[PDB]
């Protein structure tokens with residue numbers, strides 16, 4: 001096949017991108033993204049602050065611009081994200097304890113109701129683990145509300161939209177030997193033992209010199225799949241966009257039956273949150289980089 005999404009679809013997978021609503025007037029952006037991807041994540045518009053800028057007062061305008069663009073262009077949508085320490089609106093940042101817990105639940109219920117039946121995967125909880133050697137939970141208002149915040153978010157989501165696949169998403173959890181990875185593994189294992197409703201694990205896959213790709217990513221993906229969850233590569237970007245690493249990651253997904261697909265975190269290098277690291281598949285002018293060709297060839301089986 002001639003495009004990433006179509007090539008992925010031949011093996012039953014998707015190839016997605018992050019979409020920014022403010023860029024939906026950019027003809028190069030929309031035409032390349034339209035052609036190449038069959039899955040969309042809103043880069044910012046489905047986050048807590050965007051969707052609930054005042055408590056109880058939802059604003060889906062920008063989110064729906066992304067959603068509607070996706071489905072008008074034949075893509076499915078991953079919802080990102082319902083419960084996270086970052087990009088909280090001010091009103092939620094000030095809450096703690098039981099009041100925060102109620103607001104977290106209310107936010108999940110309101111957003112999922114708006115999209116009920118329409119979104120195939122939700123990143124219900126994002127980035128709950130600390131970096132480094134401890135495997136501890138990240139300090140946040142949510143974590144301070146109790147260790148059960150994650151499980152409660154998942155149980156809330158399962159009740160709100162039983163059709164959605166519920167994902168836990170994080171970064172620096174790709175290398176099988178890292179403490180953070182093992183913390184996430186043991187959480188998912190615990191959730192499956194205690195009946196907590198988790199369907200998928202998202203590996204953000206932000207690879208760079210401080211958190212480099214390792215061939216053991218395939219092992220990580222296999223081992224999580226064996227716990228009885230799907231796995232997905234959710235926010236892939238790679239410092240310098242080396243073709244070799246991009247091919248390795250693609251082949252790791254293709255090797256694991258329950259790897260649903262790959263999303264890259266943007267279209268052109270200049271669209272990237274980390275543009276200075278030139279970490280994506282298209283040049284600033286929209287042309288294909290060497291890494292594009294390596295991914296397409298891997299998806300096509302040679």
Ligand SMILES: O[C@@H]1[C@@H](O)[C@H](O[C@@H]2CCNC[C@H]2O)OC[C@H]1O
Nearest residue numbers: 043044080126171204235272273
């Ligand atoms: O525009 C930027 C987004 O790309 C960025 O997205 C996060 C990358 C790290 N993982 C979670 C994602 O939501 O969020 C910051 C924003 O400024």
